[PDB]
Design a protein around this ligand. Sequence first.
Ligand code: RET
Ligand code: RET
Ligand code: RET
Lengths: 223, 223, 223
Amino acid sequence: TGRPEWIWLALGTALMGLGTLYFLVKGMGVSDPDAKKFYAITTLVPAIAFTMYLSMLLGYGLTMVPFGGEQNPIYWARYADWLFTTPLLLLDLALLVDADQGTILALVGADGIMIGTGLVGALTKVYSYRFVWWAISTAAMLYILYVLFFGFTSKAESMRPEVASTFKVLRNVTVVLWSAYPVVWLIGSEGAGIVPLNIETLLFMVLDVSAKVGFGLILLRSR
Amino acid sequence: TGRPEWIWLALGTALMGLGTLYFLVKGMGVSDPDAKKFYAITTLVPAIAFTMYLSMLLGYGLTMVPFGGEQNPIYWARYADWLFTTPLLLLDLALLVDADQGTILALVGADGIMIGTGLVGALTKVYSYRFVWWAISTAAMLYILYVLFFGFTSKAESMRPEVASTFKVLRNVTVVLWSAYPVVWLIGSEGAGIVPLNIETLLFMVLDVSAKVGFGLILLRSR
Amino acid sequence: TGRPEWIWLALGTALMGLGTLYFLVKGMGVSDPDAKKFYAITTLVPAIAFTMYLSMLLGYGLTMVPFGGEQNPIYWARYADWLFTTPLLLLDLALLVDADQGTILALVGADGIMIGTGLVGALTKVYSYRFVWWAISTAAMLYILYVLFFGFTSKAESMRPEVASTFKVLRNVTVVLWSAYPVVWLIGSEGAGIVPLNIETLLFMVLDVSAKVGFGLILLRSR
Ligand SMILES: *C\C=C(C)/C=C/C=C(C)/C=C/C1=C(C)CCCC1(C)C
Ligand SMILES: *C\C=C(C)/C=C/C=C(C)/C=C/C1=C(C)CCCC1(C)C
Ligand SMILES: *C\C=C(C)/C=C/C=C(C)/C=C/C1=C(C)CCCC1(C)C
């Protein structure tokens, strides 16, 4: 219990676990081949995040990185969490509009370099270089959101009216949640070191719970 | 040769290698698109396990973890082995019954958290927490075997009579092999520390050879 | 700037980055579902390699391995680069001939053991064992090139005349680029220690740029 941010990690663990339970219950009795696919995706994300937060809570997913003159605690498991869940979330958005195979490859490929290079920067000791990697990651993020705002919204307007507006909603939710992460990274202890780790951990917990449970609550209650 | 369990690692390496050779020979001349798919899966598993056991034999795949008052040797490569092969095995069982896409995603997703969290527990230093991760892993295992016993056996009874009984057999073999692993983990040096590492290594070698060669011998000699 | 081979790492970073930019520009306006698939693949490779070389340049992707009586610098990120790009390249060659699903699984599976076991050997401290892993890796390489020379060239002669000769070309380019890697490994500081790290790094940069940009230049300018 030596880490004062642990309460957020505890809240974070608990909400992911229950989030997993809700989707698990709701998905029972679904025989429609398509919905079964969406529920398969939409349940796996909080189950992974649960194990990650529990790792973070229990302390297994964090190491010490010397930069800025300090021994900075780095929740490397938070990055492992993102690497496993953001491509699942991307599939949930692409399958919606029935994207071609190639856009899915590039979108998930864009997504891996984003999260991989942030971790690179997150473990990077030379203070200046840390932000080189932050720039590369955020450029990747821009490719993702460009594809989902000007490539998918086109595909949405030719499909069903139920999937159109349903995508419009989740597209917008995606736009504003994803873009807050690099901001919080930049002002936190991994970047400029203004916001403290404790606050930073709180900020990442609320976003993760919103992105990993709330996103599915939207989708799984859609026609 | 400092490790007395090395003989099992050596036997283990040798049987995986020959297992790989048999399936490689048997698969020559197969032009049927489907069987080619099964043989692709059914050969890759022993080839990976070979490299892992050889790593374990040669010692590259093992580290020391302090718990229970000792510096416990941990064959982390055995866990790497499982993470690469159990989802291949799962595909071999799902493709059999022609499962929908979503059940395959959830089954392999269930399977990754199982093996990932066991490794987490296997490297976990705080003795009590080790079994927290064991509980999470085994819960995942139950989801897998639930899906394969009450979801696939239904899909098996509507397909071909050759694939029905052929799945019935491999379903049962899966049920009893997979469930022995968490038991052996629990009584071995990674858990309760009753069974010695040497015995433990023997137990994991016989199960791995059965699960990775024998399983394919069943499947690859089926209509 | 302590590493004299850094100039090659710098050249290497710069060419990957521009390579990424060219394919990105060229792929704009492509609405054909198939070409979009090829461009998705053909752009991701230099974007990954860019980040890897930049990691190598910036130094994040290299560690020290004691063997042969020295503390050998090991660019582990160069191996991470290959593990992410060679299966993409393999898809670019298989999708060309419209290979069945099973050959793709085995080819990419062959490809992972190749790169995984080389890294194993590359980090292996006991000098003799290093070449055990080199032998296992090269055997994998032979399986890949066997499949692409006697299995795909057959599939090429029954498809379109535009894809036939286009595959003939890229098949041959693949044959001679891939096979130079284990040679350079063998004569470099990771193996026999004749060629110096500086030269070795130069050799791997020219091959990587040829394999990761030039290969796509061929393919993306084909009918
Ligand atoms: C858990 C769910 C989601 C949507 C997680 C999203 C995370 C990101 C978009 C992370 C982005 C980063 C960028 C673009 C650059 C700074 C480092 C980050 C990895 C935080
Ligand atoms: C190599 C082939 C197979 C089928 C390997 C199976 C391994 C498992 C089912 C492992 C299970 C575990 C559980 C459920 C909990 C304790 C830790 C383990 C990873 C051993
Ligand atoms: C970046 C693009 C390509 C095509 C990279 C290819 C790398 C290889 C074929 C590596 C092969 C190895 C073998 C077969 C054995 C020695 C160790 C290596 C990993 C270099």
